Design a protein around this ligand. Structure first.
Ligand SMILES: [Mg+2]
Ligand SMILES: [Mg+2]
Ligand SMILES: [Mg+2]
Ligand SMILES: [Mg+2]
Ligand SMILES: [Mg+2]
Ligand SMILES: [Mg+2]
Ligand SMILES: [Mg+2]
Ligand SMILES: [Mg+2]
Ligand SMILES: [Mg+2]
Ligand SMILES: [Mg+2]
Ligand SMILES: [Mg+2]
Ligand SMILES: [Mg+2]
Ligand SMILES: [Mg+2]
Ligand SMILES: [Mg+2]
Ligand SMILES: [Mg+2]
Ligand SMILES: [Mg+2]
Ligand SMILES: [Mg+2]
Ligand SMILES: [Mg+2]
Ligand SMILES: [Mg+2]
Ligand SMILES: [Mg+2]
Ligand SMILES: [Mg+2]
Ligand SMILES: [Mg+2]
Ligand SMILES: [Mg+2]
Ligand SMILES: [Mg+2]
Ligand SMILES: [Mg+2]
Ligand SMILES: [Mg+2]
Ligand SMILES: [Mg+2]
Ligand SMILES: [Mg+2]
Ligand SMILES: [Mg+2]
Ligand SMILES: [Mg+2]
Ligand SMILES: [Mg+2]
Ligand SMILES: [Mg+2]
Ligand SMILES: [Mg+2]
Ligand SMILES: [Mg+2]
Ligand SMILES: [Mg+2]
Ligand SMILES: [Mg+2]
Ligand SMILES: [Mg+2]
Ligand SMILES: [Mg+2]
Ligand SMILES: [Mg+2]
Ligand SMILES: [Mg+2]
Ligand SMILES: [Mg+2]
Ligand SMILES: [Mg+2]
Ligand SMILES: [Mg+2]
Ligand SMILES: [Mg+2]
Ligand SMILES: [Mg+2]
Ligand SMILES: [Mg+2]
Ligand SMILES: [Mg+2]
Ligand SMILES: [Mg+2]
Ligand SMILES: [Mg+2]
Ligand SMILES: [Mg+2]
Ligand SMILES: [Mg+2]
Ligand SMILES: [Mg+2]
Ligand SMILES: [Mg+2]
Ligand SMILES: [Mg+2]
Ligand SMILES: [Mg+2]
Ligand SMILES: [Mg+2]
Ligand SMILES: [Mg+2]
Ligand SMILES: [Mg+2]
Ligand SMILES: [Mg+2]
Ligand SMILES: [Mg+2]
Ligand SMILES: [Mg+2]
Ligand SMILES: [Mg+2]
Ligand SMILES: [Mg+2]
Ligand SMILES: [Mg+2]
Ligand SMILES: [Mg+2]
Ligand SMILES: [Mg+2]
Ligand SMILES: [Mg+2]
Ligand SMILES: [Mg+2]
Lengths: 94, 46, 271
RNA sequence: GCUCGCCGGAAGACCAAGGGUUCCUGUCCAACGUUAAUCGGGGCAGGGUGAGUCGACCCCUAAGGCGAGGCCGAAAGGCGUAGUCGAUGGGAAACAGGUUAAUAUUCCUGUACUUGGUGUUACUGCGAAGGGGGGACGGAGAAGGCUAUGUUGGCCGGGCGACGGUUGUCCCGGUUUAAGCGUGUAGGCUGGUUUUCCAGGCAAAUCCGGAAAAUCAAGGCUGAGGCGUGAUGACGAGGCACUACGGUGCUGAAGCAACAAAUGCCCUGCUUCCAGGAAAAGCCUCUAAGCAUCAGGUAACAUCAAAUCGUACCCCAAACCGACACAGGUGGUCAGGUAGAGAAUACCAAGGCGCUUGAGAGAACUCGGGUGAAGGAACUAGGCAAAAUGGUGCCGUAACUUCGGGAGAAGGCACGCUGAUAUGUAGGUGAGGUCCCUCGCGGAUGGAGCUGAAAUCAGUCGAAGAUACCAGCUGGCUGCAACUGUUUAUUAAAAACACAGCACUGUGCAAACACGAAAGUGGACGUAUACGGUGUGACGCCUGCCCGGUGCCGGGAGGUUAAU
RNA sequence: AGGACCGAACCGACUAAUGUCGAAAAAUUAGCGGAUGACUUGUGGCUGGGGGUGAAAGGCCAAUCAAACCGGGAGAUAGCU
């Protein structure tokens, strides 16, 4: 099974946006920015064992990184994996 | 007018790609020369 | 049968087709087909060795049984079939025991004859049996050079070689080109001439015919430039040199046969 | 925001290739944009790419690459067997509707579907790097059957008119509905089932192939569309509540027929032609050694699983290739109306743009055009350019000819519109009704409705009726090349090159010959009716004399002559 | 049936003018040729420098071609400017 170490390493942070808020309010789906190599089963098992929720299924994607210009210098701030964790009905959470 | 460069990454990474350079011995010399020159973009492969 | 064409349009005025009405219109017996990939005159180096080869319509290779080891088992020729690889028509024959095989088509065969192979077989066009049992003086085709190697002498469209004499372990063959060659007297032969005897009466008509058959054009020598062909060059028409091949050897008369390994088997070269 | 103009087989709507954030909101305009810019593909910040079903990975192979050993090569290395890679190809499954400032066959709703693993019961012999079938295939042509789609009538809703008329055969808008499941038709291919054996399928086989016997005469494979269900649901003209004066919120009528109809589907069909038209796995099937209360196979139900990567945006372009926001280049797919043979062309619909400098004046001169008195090539190197001709039907049509041609030769003549034939015809399509029935997605009748040429006759308007756009200039003599073709990317398209044909010649197969120190390859899985080389260049009539010179071929007496 | 015929897409490049510090290091416009084939096109392979390829022009081989490009011998040599 998934060990607790990896289970904890999976999730990085929640997400804050207008799409994030409208999703969590309407379709009962949270959004989590997660470590770039964590899979669907890992994300689902981790949100379950960590938030005491029942999750339906996770839709995940990799937002592509942006190129920024500091002075004359060009750089690539990362890409990262953004997961739409669609909770099961009736579940509330802090 | 059909200009000369008609890009395609399959053909590019097959003809000049890193492993196509590392296959032969002469390509190994190409890599040695570029490494000793200090190139940042070593091969054409990303 | 040879048939002209009505001059409906230039390029059709000078063509003559060769048609056969009991041939097979359909698909060839599949288990005897293998894929055939055209090389266009290029060897495994990638360079062009024999010029004038390329293009041409796709073909599949009909497997043909030239060795003919099916001894004593009588077969019936199920049908005659067009063959794209070669100039003689093939014949799908079905043996008594249910195995099918392609063979070359002797002349006197058509839908429904019987063949027997091996030293037992009777002497009829199509049967095959070694030239230690063929009567002396007969005409055969598909003659092997070594015992059991495979049909090599005269398997073309209108050819046949005559067993002129047998003196010991070697029989003298008057070959189609006119040689007299001593072939080992245990080589297989198959009686009678080959089938498509009118393949030399056809004409191609339009360059399109050669291009369909896969023969690229040929740019002759007094048109090239001196860097390309030894003949090439000259303001206007100039040809003041003895004809040579593009690699600088004689081409009008110079003999080339140098295989001293078999000069003992050539009884008499042709004239 | 209203008018105007341009695109509309594109300058519209989706992608691949390729870029890489150009996408969306907020703020800013110093630079960038050929001008100002409050605007932007510019600067900064925030957001945005959601998949069992799409694509990739994956399974499978082509050309080809690499290639254990191997063979070969001063070394580097070259080729290649077993293998292993390589999609531009073959292989499981999803659609409709809604929704975001930006994503959707991915989210939401509704209804599905395939393939494994696992479980519980019922019967069963399963079993492969092996055998067999399948997958599995060309060009052209021909209709038939349909559909997408379109036109009209009907129905439903709204209208009844800025200026003469418009409750009527009047006007505008709508009339939509998928996968799946079920029935499973038009068409296409094939005669079925059983028994007995056989040297074939490198072993076996109950499979395939072969040979004989009975045997009923039909079964089966396949298949678009239609019709049910999906769906008393979604959608739906509009009305009304709401305004952040963005567009939101809430209900919601009709939702059918007839006809025309693809370049799409049946159709990887059918006919015919030669130029004779990939492979491999998935799939079905057979067993071998082997395991044989088990394991495994099949069916049923429940169950788990479907990972990973791409998904924004542009994509005939301001984002791609061209140094540029460049009059260039770039593969696939979608295909409305009227006129027309048509994807031409003119005008339009949806949809998108007015091309990132303007405002005046209305000289010469240049550019792109319009028209022209009288003459009509007098211009000129030369009718260069321009002008002209131009369509369908019929009439007629010379020399020459290889008997196909020449030929659309040339030359004319008719063409609009309205009525009548005929309240729209011949035609195509075909309901209702009736009849038989192996009752159906059937057949014979039957003709309403619908669609609808072309012609004749009468009238009529204009200067002109193929009115625009579109759309051969024609004829006579002759050179050269037979011809369609190919060529100097970027000053030469020709009489040059090629060509079918012709002839000479080499080559007997471990072929000549080419590539390569060599192995090995091409020639060719061909074999003298074959291949290589060289000249000539369809066809018709032809092809004369010269072997001294040079090459080639043959000959060996003699002379000369190397290494040894 | 056809290297048949007319003609759009697609492919080409005959003539003319414009352009020739161009809109463009070869294009535009008005005409023009082929348009079921010796056709055209996408993807991916293969052939290489005295070598490839060439329906043959000494053309083409990354805007370079009677011997490519790059690096080196190399500061070649220059009785010439
Ligand atoms: Mg761990
Ligand atoms: Mg989901
Ligand atoms: Mg190679
Ligand atoms: Mg051949
Ligand atoms: Mg020839
Ligand atoms: Mg050359
Ligand atoms: Mg020479
Ligand atoms: Mg000259
Ligand atoms: Mg001369
Ligand atoms: Mg010589
Ligand atoms: Mg149209
Ligand atoms: Mg567009
Ligand atoms: Mg891309
Ligand atoms: Mg760029
Ligand atoms: Mg930026
Ligand atoms: Mg500015
Ligand atoms: Mg500029
Ligand atoms: Mg911006
Ligand atoms: Mg789903
Ligand atoms: Mg190799
Ligand atoms: Mg593979
Ligand atoms: Mg949708
Ligand atoms: Mg079995
Ligand atoms: Mg098999
Ligand atoms: Mg009403
Ligand atoms: Mg009024
Ligand atoms: Mg109406
Ligand atoms: Mg409609
Ligand atoms: Mg079904
Ligand atoms: Mg057997
Ligand atoms: Mg049987
Ligand atoms: Mg099409
Ligand atoms: Mg056993
Ligand atoms: Mg079991
Ligand atoms: Mg969009
Ligand atoms: Mg442009
Ligand atoms: Mg650009
Ligand atoms: Mg269409
Ligand atoms: Mg318009
Ligand atoms: Mg509009
Ligand atoms: Mg003026
Ligand atoms: Mg006037
Ligand atoms: Mg004028
Ligand atoms: Mg005048
Ligand atoms: Mg006049
Ligand atoms: Mg006149
Ligand atoms: Mg002119
Ligand atoms: Mg004109
Ligand atoms: Mg006319
Ligand atoms: Mg005359
Ligand atoms: Mg005549
Ligand atoms: Mg004439
Ligand atoms: Mg006429
Ligand atoms: Mg009219
Ligand atoms: Mg009339
Ligand atoms: Mg008139
Ligand atoms: Mg004369
Ligand atoms: Mg022509
Ligand atoms: Mg071979
Ligand atoms: Mg001699
Ligand atoms: Mg033609
Ligand atoms: Mg050009
Ligand atoms: Mg033009
Ligand atoms: Mg044209
Ligand atoms: Mg070399
Ligand atoms: Mg360049
Ligand atoms: Mg110097
Ligand atoms: Mg030196």
């Amino acid at each position: 099974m998934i060990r607790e170490e990896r289970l904890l390493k999976v999730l990085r942070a929640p997400h804050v946006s207008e799409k994030a808020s409208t999703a969590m309010e309407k379709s009962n789906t949270i959004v989590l920015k997660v470590a770039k190599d964590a899979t669907k089963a890992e994300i689902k098992a981790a949100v379950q064992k960590l938030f005491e929720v029942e999750v339906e299924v996770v839709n995940t994607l990799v937002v592509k990184g942006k190129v920024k210009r500091h002075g004359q210098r060009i750089g690539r701030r990362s890409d990262w994996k953004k997961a739409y964790v669609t909770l099961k009905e009736g579940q509330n959470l802090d | 007018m059909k200009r000369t460069f008609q890009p395609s990454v399959l053909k590019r990474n097959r003809s000049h790609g890193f492993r196509a350079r590392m296959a032969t011995k002469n390509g190994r010399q190409v890599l040695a020369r570029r490494r000793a020159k200090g190139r940042a973009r070593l091969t054409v492969s990303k | 049968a040879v048939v002209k064409c009505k001059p409906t349009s230039p390029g059709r005025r000078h063509v003559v087709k060769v048609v056969n009405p009991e041939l097979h219109k359909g698909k060839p017996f599949a288990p005897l087909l293998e894929k055939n990939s055209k090389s266009g005159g290029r060897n495994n180096n990638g360079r062009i060795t024999t010029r004038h080869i390329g293009g041409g319509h796709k073909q599949a290779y009909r497997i043909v049984d030239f060795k003919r080891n099916k001894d004593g088992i009588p077969a019936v020729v199920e049908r005659l079939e067009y063959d794209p690889n070669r100039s003689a028509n093939i014949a799908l024959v079905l043996y008594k025991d249910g195995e099918r095989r392609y063979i070359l088509a002797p002349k006197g065969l058509k839908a429904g004859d019987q063949i027997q192979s091996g030293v037992d077989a009777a002497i009829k066009p199509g049967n095959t049996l070694p030239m230690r049992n063929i009567p002396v003086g007969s005409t055969v085709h598909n003659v092997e050079m070594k015992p059991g190697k495979g049909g090599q002498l005269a398997r073309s469209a209108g050819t046949y070689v005559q067993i002129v004499a047998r003196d010991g372990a070697y029989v003298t063959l008057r070959l189609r080109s006119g040689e007299m060659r001593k072939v080992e007297a245990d080589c297989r032969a198959t009686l009678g001439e080959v089938g498509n005897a009118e393949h030399m009466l056809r004409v191609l008509g339009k360059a399109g015919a050669a291009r369909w058959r896969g023969v690229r054009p040929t740019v002759r020598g007094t048109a090239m430039n001196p860097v390309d062909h030894p003949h090439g060059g000259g303001e206007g028409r100039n040809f003041g040199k003895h004809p040579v091949t593009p690699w600088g050897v004689q081409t009008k008369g110079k003999k080339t046969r140098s295989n001293k390994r078999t000069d003992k088997f050539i009884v008499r070269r042709r004239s």
